[PDB]
Amino acid sequence: STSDLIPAPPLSKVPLQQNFQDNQFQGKWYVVGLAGNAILREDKDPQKMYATIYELKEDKSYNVTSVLFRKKKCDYAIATFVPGSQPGEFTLGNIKSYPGLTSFLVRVVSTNYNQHAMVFFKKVSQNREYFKITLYGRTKELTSELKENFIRFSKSLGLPENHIVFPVPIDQCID
Numbered sequence: 001s002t003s004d005l006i007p008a009p010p011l012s013k014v015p016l017q018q019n020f021q022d023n024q025f026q027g028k029w030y031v032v033g034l035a036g037n038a039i040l041r042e043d044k045d046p047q048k049m050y051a052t053i054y055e056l057k058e059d060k061s062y063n064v065t066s067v068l069f070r071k072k073k074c075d076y077a078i079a080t081f082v083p084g085s086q087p088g089e090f091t092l093g094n095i096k097s098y099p100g101l102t103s104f105l106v107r108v109v110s111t112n113y114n115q116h117a118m119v120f121f122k123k124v125s126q127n128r129e130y131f132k133i134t135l136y137g138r139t140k141e142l143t144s145e146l147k148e149n150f151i152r153f154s155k156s157l158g159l160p161e162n163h164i165v166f167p168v169p170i171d172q173c174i175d
């Protein structure tokens with residue numbers, strides 16, 4: 001809440017997926033890996049897998065729904081991602097609805113659309129700058145190769161290994 005943070009990387013270290021295809025990116029993605037400056041590995045109580053669903057609207061923004069299993073319930077969080085400056089980037093719709101949130105950016109780093117994606121998120125909340133990379137899969141499992149590529153990438157942004165987690169597959173809520 002008050003603690004020091006690993007700095008957000010310059011955006012020059014975060015690639016953008018070439019010729020992003022919004023229609024192909026839609027649908028359900030499972031969070032198979034998660035890294036960030038507020039993300040901490042927890043052996044005592046491991047992060048559980050959650051899912052994020054991207055529905056492309058006629059106006060070209062996404063209605064985004066995250067589905068999580070928390071405290072024996074299904075928690076649903078909804079947002080609107082508005083197309084940003086370059087295809088594959090997004091800003092947050094209705095940002096004034098979010099107390100303390102002054103900046104929000106999504107950048108799709110890499111994806112093949114049918115199996116995996118890596119996506120960078122940065123926000124400033126109460127003037128503190130957070131960033132996250134998610135490794136998304138169309139299924140709950142990915143290859144060793146994709147997972148190591150993701151660790152390599154997360155580290156290139158200055159995150160140590162204790163800031164890189166692999167949520168445990170579950171069946172509740174996310175299917």
Ligand SMILES: N[C@@H](CO)C(=O)OC[C@H](NC(=O)c1cccc(O)c1O)C(=O)O
Binds near residue numbers: 038123130
């Ligand atoms: N301020 C806290 C409130 O949860 C926080 O951001 O930490 C939560 C953490 N998420 C993030 O740090 C985070 C970073 C950049 C953009 C986002 O949309 C995030 O959600 C997580 O996913 O467990």
Ligand SMILES: [Cl-]
Binds near residue numbers: 069070071072
């Ligand atoms: Cl819980």
Ligand SMILES: [Cl-]
Binds near residue numbers: 143
């Ligand atoms: Cl493998």
Ligand SMILES: [Cl-]
Binds near residue numbers: 159160161162
């Ligand atoms: Cl390390």
